Amino acid sequence: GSGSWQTYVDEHLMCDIEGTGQHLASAAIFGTDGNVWAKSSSFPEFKPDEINAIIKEFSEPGALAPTGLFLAGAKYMVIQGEPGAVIRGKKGAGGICIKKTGQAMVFGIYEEPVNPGQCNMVVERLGDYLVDQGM
Numbered sequence: 442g443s444g445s446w447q448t449y450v451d452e453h454l455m456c457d458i459e460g461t462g463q464h465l466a467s468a469a470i471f472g473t474d475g476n477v478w479a480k481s482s483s484f485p486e487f488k489p490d491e492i493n494a495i496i497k498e499f500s501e502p503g504a505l506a507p508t509g510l511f512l513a514g515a516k517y518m519v520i521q522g523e524p525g526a527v528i529r530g531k532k533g534a535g536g537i538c539i540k541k542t543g544q545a546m547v548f549g550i551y552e553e554p555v556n557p558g559q560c561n562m563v564v565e566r567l568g569d570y571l572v573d574q575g576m
């Protein structure tokens with residue numbers, strides 16, 4: 442395996458999904474402390490409050506409920522995740538999905554015709570590999 446976090450963006454997250462010709466709109470990987478470790482070229486203009494609120498939601502599922510999930514000022518409605526493990530959100534023509542690993546958080550952002558399950562499969566396959574590697 443590779444020695445750069447950026448490889449997981451370029452060579453997994455952003456790759457065409459199951460031969461559909463479609464791909465995530467953007468993807469990124471953040472450390473637990475909230476700095477960006479890897480990103481795709483159209484990952485949006487995130488701010489620190491937003492990343493912190495997501496770190497909080499991994500610790501305390503349900504904490505985003507009154508507000509929604511913001512990323513680069515766009516609001517996503519929270520949809521069922523996996524407590525402590527996966528956060529998901531929906532907007533009108535797309536959505537977001539975020540998988541926690543030991544060291545990091547893997548973000549995928551999608552637009553139609555990509556669907557919530559496709560996001561989940563791409564991000565969770567990577568996150569499961571990373572955890573197996575101690576990351």
Ligand SMILES: [Cl-]
Binds near residue numbers: 472473474476477
């Ligand atoms: Cl960090």
